[PDB]
# Entry
Amino acid sequence: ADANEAVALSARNIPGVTVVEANGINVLDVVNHEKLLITKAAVEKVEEVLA
Amino acid sequence: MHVKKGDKVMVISGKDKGKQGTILAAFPKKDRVLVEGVNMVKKHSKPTQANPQGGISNQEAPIHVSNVMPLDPKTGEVTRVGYKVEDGKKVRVAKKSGQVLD
Amino acid sequence: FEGGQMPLFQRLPKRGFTNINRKEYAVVNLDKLNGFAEGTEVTPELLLETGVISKLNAGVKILGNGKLEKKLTVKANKFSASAKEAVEAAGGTAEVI
RNA sequence: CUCGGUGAAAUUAUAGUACCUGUGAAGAUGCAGGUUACCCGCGACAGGACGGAAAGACCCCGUGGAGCUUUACUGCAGCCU
RNA sequence: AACAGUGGUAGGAGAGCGUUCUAAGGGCUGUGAAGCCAGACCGGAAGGACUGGUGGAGCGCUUAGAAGUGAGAAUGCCGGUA
RNA sequence: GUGGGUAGGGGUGAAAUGCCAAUCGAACCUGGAGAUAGCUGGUUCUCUCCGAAAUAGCUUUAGGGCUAGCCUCAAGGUAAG
RNA sequence: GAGCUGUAAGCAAGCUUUGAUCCGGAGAUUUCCGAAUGGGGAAACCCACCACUCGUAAUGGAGUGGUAUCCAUAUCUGAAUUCAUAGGAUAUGAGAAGGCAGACCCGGGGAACUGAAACAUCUAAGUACCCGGAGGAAGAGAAAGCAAAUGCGAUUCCCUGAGUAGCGGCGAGCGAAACGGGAUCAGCCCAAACCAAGAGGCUUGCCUCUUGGGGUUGUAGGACACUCUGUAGGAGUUACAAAGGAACGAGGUAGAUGAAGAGGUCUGGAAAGGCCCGCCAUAGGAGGUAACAGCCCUGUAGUCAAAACUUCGUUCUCUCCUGAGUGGAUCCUGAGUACGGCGGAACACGUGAAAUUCCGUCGGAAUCCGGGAGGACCAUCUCCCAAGGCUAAAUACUCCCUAGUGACCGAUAGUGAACCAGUACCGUGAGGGAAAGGUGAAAAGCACCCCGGAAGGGGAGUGAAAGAGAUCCUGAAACCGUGUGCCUACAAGUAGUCAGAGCCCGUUAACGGGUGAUGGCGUGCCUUUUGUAGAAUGAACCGGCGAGUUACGAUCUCGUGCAAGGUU
Ligand SMILES: [K+]
Ligand SMILES: [K+]
Ligand SMILES: [K+]
Ligand SMILES: [K+]
Ligand SMILES: [K+]
Ligand SMILES: [K+]
Ligand SMILES: [K+]
Ligand SMILES: [K+]
Ligand SMILES: [K+]
Ligand SMILES: [K+]
Ligand SMILES: [K+]
Ligand SMILES: [K+]
Ligand SMILES: [K+]
Ligand SMILES: [K+]
Ligand SMILES: [K+]
Ligand SMILES: [K+]
Ligand SMILES: [K+]
Ligand SMILES: [K+]
Ligand SMILES: [Mg+2]
Ligand SMILES: [Mg+2]
Ligand SMILES: [Mg+2]
Ligand SMILES: [Mg+2]
Ligand SMILES: [Mg+2]
Ligand SMILES: [Mg+2]
Ligand SMILES: [Mg+2]
Ligand SMILES: [Mg+2]
Ligand SMILES: [Mg+2]
Ligand SMILES: [Mg+2]
Ligand SMILES: [Mg+2]
Ligand SMILES: [Mg+2]
Ligand SMILES: [Mg+2]
Ligand SMILES: [Mg+2]
Ligand SMILES: [Mg+2]
Ligand SMILES: [Mg+2]
Ligand SMILES: [Mg+2]
Ligand SMILES: [Mg+2]
Ligand SMILES: [Mg+2]
Ligand SMILES: [Mg+2]
Ligand SMILES: [Mg+2]
Ligand SMILES: [Mg+2]
Ligand SMILES: [Mg+2]
Ligand SMILES: [Mg+2]
Ligand SMILES: [Mg+2]
Ligand SMILES: [Mg+2]
Ligand SMILES: [Mg+2]
Ligand SMILES: [Mg+2]
Ligand SMILES: [Mg+2]
Ligand SMILES: [Mg+2]
Ligand SMILES: [Mg+2]
Ligand SMILES: [Mg+2]
Ligand SMILES: [Mg+2]
Ligand SMILES: [Mg+2]
Ligand SMILES: [Mg+2]
Ligand SMILES: [Mg+2]
Ligand SMILES: [Mg+2]
Ligand SMILES: [Mg+2]
Ligand SMILES: [Mg+2]
Ligand SMILES: [Mg+2]
# Structure
């Protein structure tokens, strides 16, 4: 939902695992990654903007 | 370099992989070392004044420094190199055990 | 260019002038006013906010194309004769502002 | 010119590259019909290859240029007032 | 299926081939990549494989994207050699 | 002979437009500059569908151009041709 | 922190844990030429004078420093000429000079080709170019503004307005601005009245000049008077006065530390590759390493580090400093100015209906009961207060330095230049201006033998490979050769094609391959043309390179989203 430092740092070095905020979601990142791991807070934040 | 003249090292790569030996000389500018008994070449020396007879001389040729690792003093196994400050002096230490290489 | 035949534009005369003080109004026909519910004071600010008109220009003129079946207090800069009739005919009040 | 030494060039679509009469962008080694001709050179000669050389100087065209002229046009310097 | 059509310059229209690079996916490759050489293979064309030799480290394929994307002529330019 | 002077819309000329670095009806170099070229040359893979024109009018126009004519593609009208 | 005395091998002689080489900060030295400056000169040379120093008995010789011009300031002399002044002399000056980054900026001067299908107004274009001046930016800037609202409030730049308004042989073309939306924001100091003090002309209580105070503007402000009020809180070296110091913090200019596999096994010259297993990861950036490495090395993430010089910020210090009201007696508020005529230029605006701005020339105001502007002009109204100055930021550009990036190049490309290139070479000169990358992982760079004067070669050895042996990866084509399966010395040839024996082969196995006696048919390719085998054009051959692109607008088709709305 917000900029999680620990998650962003922990995932940084794993190949093929990108971390974004809710506002930083984009078509290319969604389509390029197989799985989409969203938090409940982030889903609410996405639904705020898009819906 | 991570090794120096005088160090016993294991050759970890090349034809002489597995062979231990002392570094007879180091070449920091080329990142190469001369290890005793390792990478022998047959030089075809013509008759000079310095070498009067000539002939085919068997001599060590340098290998790349990244193909050798220093031995751990405890186990005798290869080790990566760390550094600690002891008595003011910096010393190389075996990362495997902990003990001082030099 | 017509290969040296006197070009069309140049054969024909210039006509008219441009008025420095020309007013163009944002026109609104009666069919657009049907969008609003009865009792709504249709001001230029409301028309612009709702997006019935995109820009104001000199002002809002109400014109008399289409039908009106809503009692509205239409407030506008200008009205056509038929528009002012049609607003008043269906219970409304055309007000020049 | 012959032998020994050394060794360029212009040119050149590929060529196993006859002659006659004809034909054809109207003057053909190369097309047609005939006539003649074993294969490869060397010394010579220039009739042809519309031979080579140089995107014809002539001529015309370009709303191309340049130099020159004058009572062409429009200007400017200088000079006079 | 039937019927009809399919010469073509300028030129309009359509469908494709191949080249380099990128993305994603999926592969190949020191048990030998690209390139090069050869062959009597395949496709309607552009073209594409397969096998062997040379070579000695890179390269296809699929889908999409982007172009310094294709040469036989320019008295073209540079090189080489007649 | 040596040392000097004159410089390009200029110099110099016992005058030929002669000469000014194998350049002269206006030197050479660099730049404006990829000047402009209605002119000539060239313009690179394939197959299929269709397929002209070399005419009229006007044009400082006549080997250029424009509009019309003739070709092509698409969408309509539909069945006028 | 263990090697080192560069390219660059090599012998030589040495240095270095008593810390070298090497890296960074600050110093020292720094020939001669060059602005070049003691004078001269054909740059890198020559010749001086004056001090002091070395040397000689002395001359000759040598060393160090000073000695250009202009300008500023001061002092001393002071011509014709009386006082003077000009001029001269001397001293003090981190005063100027010259260069460049082929960029950006502001000025002075300023083309033409070209476009207009000719051409002169016009365009190209105030471009190129030359010249002057800069600065890190410059220029502009605090309303004699924009405008026409119950307004705005310095300038600059971006979006938009708008290819509009307009200008225009009303041709070709040229082409705004304000409003609106943003970036950034900051305002000030004088001149004058007047006051005080001093100076020199006494013009003789007047005037002029120089310092300090005072003062700073528009439904006017200030002087001047009034009563207030401050003289140290506030401000500051980026304008608003101008120097300096300390401390603290964060950067820059060297560095330090830094996790995890030689895992096993398989090919192999070598393993970073395959297969089967681990592990680290705030580190799976990158480069290297004998083939492709997060775990081999140099590193990377993270965290640290500076004696010295340096940048920024902060705080203190330091330095500097009253700002409000009420009155209209007078006084002040930028003069050869504004403005006008004439001639030009600049304004998008070409003399036009031509405001506005600037230059030359001549004429020439008002001065608060005043002046300017609102696109001729007048009136009214509105807005403003010129003829003085300063001012950061947003903006432009990149010779450089540091870090990094690319559906950018990969040796005819990419810089002209991957290499000792602005070199070689060419030119009197300005100037023009190339070609030229690849042994190998490592020199292990072929001891030795043999032919040869050598070159070169054949062995041998090294290497994974020498047909990797020095313009040494690969190694196409033209072109040049050696060998020979088929054909060829009675033949008339765009060289093929179709028919076809004979002979020789044997494949991607196909109603195969090579050759071709003989028969039929048959005038290359391209360009340009009414028409070309053409006795029209172009190409010696082979290879490489070599031509509808991109940007911004317009329009149409197709596609997609939304739809009387769509879109920023
Ligand atoms: K002909
Ligand atoms: K002849
Ligand atoms: K191959
Ligand atoms: K050619
Ligand atoms: K000249
Ligand atoms: K002359
Ligand atoms: K010359
Ligand atoms: K049409
Ligand atoms: K002109
Ligand atoms: K023209
Ligand atoms: K290694
Ligand atoms: K004017
Ligand atoms: K004047
Ligand atoms: K105003
Ligand atoms: K070059
Ligand atoms: K042969
Ligand atoms: K035949
Ligand atoms: K000819
Ligand atoms: Mg490590
Ligand atoms: Mg001879
Ligand atoms: Mg014919
Ligand atoms: Mg005839
Ligand atoms: Mg004939
Ligand atoms: Mg015949
Ligand atoms: Mg001839
Ligand atoms: Mg000719
Ligand atoms: Mg057809
Ligand atoms: Mg047919
Ligand atoms: Mg087409
Ligand atoms: Mg490739
Ligand atoms: Mg193969
Ligand atoms: Mg190309
Ligand atoms: Mg001459
Ligand atoms: Mg030009
Ligand atoms: Mg037409
Ligand atoms: Mg013209
Ligand atoms: Mg400055
Ligand atoms: Mg400066
Ligand atoms: Mg400034
Ligand atoms: Mg200041
Ligand atoms: Mg480390
Ligand atoms: Mg292992
Ligand atoms: Mg290899
Ligand atoms: Mg004033
Ligand atoms: Mg007016
Ligand atoms: Mg190459
Ligand atoms: Mg090059
Ligand atoms: Mg020379
Ligand atoms: Mg080979
Ligand atoms: Mg290699
Ligand atoms: Mg080679
Ligand atoms: Mg015979
Ligand atoms: Mg016979
Ligand atoms: Mg003809
Ligand atoms: Mg001929
Ligand atoms: Mg011709
Ligand atoms: Mg020719
Ligand atoms: Mg060629």
Q: What stands out?
A: Chain B has no helices and nine strands. The radius of gyration of chain B is 17 Å. Chains B and C do not touch (no CB pair under 8 Å). The longest strand of chain B covers residues 20-27.
